[PDB]
Sequence to fold (212 residues):
Amino acid sequence: MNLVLMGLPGAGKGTQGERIVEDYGTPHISTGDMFRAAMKEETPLGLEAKSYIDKGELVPDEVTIGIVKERLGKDDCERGFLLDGFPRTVAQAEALEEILEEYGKPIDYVINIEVDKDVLMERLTGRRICSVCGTTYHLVFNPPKTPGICDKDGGELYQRADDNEETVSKRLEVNMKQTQPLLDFYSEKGYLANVNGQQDIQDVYADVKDLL
Ligand SMILES: Nc1ncnc2c1ncn2[C@@H]1O[C@H](COP(=O)(O)OP(=O)(O)OP(=O)(O)OP(=O)(O)OP(=O)(O)OC[C@H]2O[C@@H](n3cnc4c(N)ncnc43)[C@H](O)[C@@H]2O)[C@@H](O)[C@H]1O
Ligand SMILES: [Ca+2]
Ligand SMILES: [Ca+2]
Ligand SMILES: [Mg+2]
Ligand SMILES: [Zn+2]
Fold:
């Protein structure tokens, strides 16, 4: 399966993406994760992206498309992929169509995890991420079994730098503006499927599993 996840900041892409990869083993490709790994490693690209990321702005298309094209050519994607948070502009989506023609792997589904804008700030400010594997928890909605550490590997959980009220507020503004153009682009292609992202995690995943 060649899958794309989309959704507003905090809508549950990672949470659902993780269950999809567990069940089907498709490599989980998150542009956010990739940029954060570059920033952790202090690579030139990391340092370039950081300026945009710290603001809640989109990293420019050209560099973003370039890291996805390079990633999608790697040998681990031949048995399929799960793309997460790319594309998030029509121009990214067009370039993806071209990239996927080129790698002989057309999109099976675009899954939009639809969540109400007003509930996203509380999802993000309460989010805690594992410093080792990057799985997400929430202090209320999805707590770890042991406070402060990952269930899977005991890594310390932390608050992402961009999960502050100020930066979230910009991330929502920025991505909301791109949302309908992107949903139009993909409903027009016939790949789009919508899921109600405002249910218990397992119930959102039940609905995802049905689509696949
Ligand atoms: N293509 C691109 N072009 C340009 N720039 C790009 C780019 N891709 C990335 N970037 C740059 O990188 C930045 C970061 O991008 P990115 O990391 O992709 O951030 P995002 O798209 O804002 O999504 P998040 O990872 O914050 O949320 P998610 O939807 O994965 O939610 P999660 O499952 O964690 O869940 C959220 C929380 O809610 C909880 N939760 C999950 N599901 C539920 C549920 N059903 N009910 C209640 N709580 C839930 C979780 O426990 C968690 O705490 C961008 O802002 C931009 O600067
Ligand atoms: Ca380095
Ligand atoms: Ca609303
Ligand atoms: Mg994520
Ligand atoms: Zn972990």
User: Anything to note?
Assistant: The first strand starts at residue 2 and ends at 6. The pocket of calcium ion (ligand 2) is lined by residues 41-43 (CB under 6 Å).
